[PDB]
């Protein structure tokens, strides 16, 4: 009972966290009315895996987690759980029992430039694949080769990471979409979270 | 609060050409500029985008690699250079203008126009 | 696409005549639609912005709207010095490439 949950304050953020760093949030203790949800037409990617949109608001939820990134259209696809890519298994990934689902629409009005956009990057390079739910953020020169190589870069030592080049004459599946994946623990303890009744 | 042109004549096939438009007027940093070439007997077509200074362009598909666009602020000149000209690319060009820092959006005035025949 | 336009539209003095492009969805759907007018010996200009309201000034006689895929330019009044060719542009967003797309070519008597 109160009066509103902060969900304009990350749908209409103007900076979004990068694919390496996805930043969590504490939505609690609030209202949520997801009616508002349906205001963009480009929800080409609303598809929802634990419960059914229809019947969104009339139960509610434990506590709930909102992370959000930006990548590139052909990858859209491969953040539903169980799929296989080098950003899925290396930068990002879903656990396998995954509950919530994702909200995904196109952005390329505002995170794109002419000139270009070297701001968002990701990690290509890895020592192998990474548990789910889980960030790295050491920027340790990759050792390809069987040499000792330290601090220094080039052949058979690469620099992990890679930088995105939008740019608004590309085509569909090359710009930036921005993603938002939830997370409900629905009937295990004390509700905290939702709207009318 | 005008933009200008310049003049040319024929050039031979397979070679490359040079095409500029003097600015004056407005601020010339915070204004993106369109290139667009018109041919005779149908519509014209899009070229590339601008971005004055740091001089980002970003070009079509039917016309990457064959475009060269360059700017700078001092002398205040726009540069395009074409290359690997063929008879098919007898058009008129283009320079335009726009809403400013945002490539979509109206067109301010065009310029007078340079004709190249091949 | 590549904006289908109808070659011509003749008339007569005093009579309305209208024109209108037709285009498909992601380029006529989305995102706005523009008029252009070129008249002969000179160089293109715009004759409206977002389709509505008239740019900066011009006779309240030019107007114009966009239902579904298509848009359309309603024109009477007509004089022999509007005899002219229109164009319209509008952005893509298509696969493998998205620029301004324009129109073809219309005669006007």
């Known amino acids: 009972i109160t009066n509103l949950c902060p969900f304009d304050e990350v749908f209409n953020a103007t900076r979004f966290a990068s694919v390496y760093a996805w930043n969590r949030k504490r939505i609690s203790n609030c209202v949520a009315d997801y009616s508002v949800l349906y205001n963009l037409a480009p929800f080409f990617t609303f598809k929802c895996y634990g419960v059914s949109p229809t019947k969104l608001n009339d139960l509610c939820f434990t506590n709930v987690y909102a992370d959000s990134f930006v990548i590139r259209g052909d990858e859209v696809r491969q953040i539903a759980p169980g799929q296989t890519g080098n950003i899925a298994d290396y930068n990002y990934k879903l656990p396998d029992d995954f509950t919530g689902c994702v909200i995904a629409w196109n952005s390329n009005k505002l995170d794109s430039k002419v000139s270009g956009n070297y701001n968002y990057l990701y990690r290509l390079f890895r020592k192998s694949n990474l548990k789910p739910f889980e960030r790295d953020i050491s920027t340790e020169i990759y050792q390809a080769g069987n040499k000792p190589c330290n601090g220094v870069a080039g052949f058979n030592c690469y620099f992990p990471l890679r930088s995105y080049s939008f740019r608004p004459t590309y085509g569909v599946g090359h710009q930036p979409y921005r993603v938002v994946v939830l997370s409900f623990e629905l009937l295990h303890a004390p509700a905290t979270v939702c709207g009318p009744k | 609060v005008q933009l200008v042109q310049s003049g040319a004549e024929v050039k031979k096939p397979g070679a490359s050409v040079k095409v500029s438009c003097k600015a004056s007027g407005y601020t010339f940093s915070s204004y993106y500029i369109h290139w667009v070439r018109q041919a005779p007997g149908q519509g014209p077509e899009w070229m590339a985008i601008i971005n004055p200074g740091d001089g980002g362009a970003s070009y079509a598909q039917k016309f990457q690699g064959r475009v060269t666009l360059t700017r700078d602020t001092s002398t205040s000149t726009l540069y395009m250079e074409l290359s690997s000209l063929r008879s098919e690319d007898t058009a008129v060009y283009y320079c335009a203008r726009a809403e400013g820092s945002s490539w979509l959006g109206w067109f301010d005035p065009w310029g007078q126009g340079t004709l190249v025949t091949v | 696409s590549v904006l289908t336009q109808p070659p011509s539209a003749s008339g007569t003095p005093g009579q309305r005549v209208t024109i209108s492009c037709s285009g498909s969805?992601?380029?006529?759907?989305?995102?706005?639609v523009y008029w252009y007018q070129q008249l002969p010996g000179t160089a293109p200009k715009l004759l409206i912005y977002?389709?509505?309201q008239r740019p900066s000034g011009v006779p309240d006689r030019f107007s114009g709207s966009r239902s579904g895929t298509s848009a359309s330019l309603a024109i009477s009044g007509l004089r022999s010095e509007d005899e002219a060719d229109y164009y319209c542009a509008a952005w893509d967003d298509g696969l493998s490439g998205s620029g301004w797309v324009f129109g073809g070519g219309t005669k006007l008597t």
């Open positions: 977002r389709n509505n």
């Open positions: 969805s992601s380029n006529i759907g989305s995102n706005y």
